[PDB]
Amino acid sequence: TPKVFVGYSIYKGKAALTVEPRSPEFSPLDSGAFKLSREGMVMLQFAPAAGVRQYDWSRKQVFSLSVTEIGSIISLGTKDSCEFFHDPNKGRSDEGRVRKVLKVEPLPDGSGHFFNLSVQNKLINLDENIYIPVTKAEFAVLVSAFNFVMPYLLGWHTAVNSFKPEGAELE
């Protein structure tokens, strides 16, 4: 506190994209210490274009980026690509029924990358696909922000903040 809601947004012709960090989670140990129990992540929210300058957020779709997936974006070269597959029932007998795939490839010309989100839900025959292009400059804001936030998503800031004034085994 005071809790603040933030998020970088890229608004384009066919769609809009919002990016926001989500807190990691901790669990109690002895002596009043804590353990990082769940890594934080970055949440992406895609929305299709509505009626000029506005978007239909009621038709939005979300996709998360874990620390490792953020590693793929920050190490993505000018003409490289990466794909992420999310299925809540992987391995389960009913896998492949509801899933999301995020693909990041370079634009034809070479002025940036496409962020293409595919959502499938066989239970209701849904098969949405939203894509938005992000310029090299906009990609750079993302890389700077991801680099800043990753240590916090791993909770390393809580660990080093105790590295204040107030090799151990025969290997």
Within positions 43 to 82, which residues make up the interface with a copy of itself, using CB under 8 A?
43, 61-64, 66-72, 74-75, 82
Q: How far is the CB of 58 from a copy of itself (least distance, A)?
A: 11
Q: Residues 6 or more apart from 142 whose CB is under 8 A from it? A: 8, 19, 73, 134
Rule CB under 8 A: choose which of 51, 108, 109, 162 binds a copy of itself: 162
Query: What tokens appear for 145 in the block?
Result: 């922000």
109 near a copy of itself, rule: CB under 8 A: no
125 near a copy of itself, rule: CB under 8 A: no
Q: Which of 132, 129, 128 is nearest to 113 (CA)?
A: 132
Rule CB under 8 A: choose which of 40, 46, 48, 115 binds a copy of itself: 40
d(CA 153, CA 40): 4
Rule CB under 8 A: choose which of 16, 17, 18, 24 binds a copy of itself: 24
d(CA 100, CA 119): 5
Residue count at the site for a copy of itself (CB under 8 A)? 90
Q: Which residue has the tokens 């962020």?
A: 115
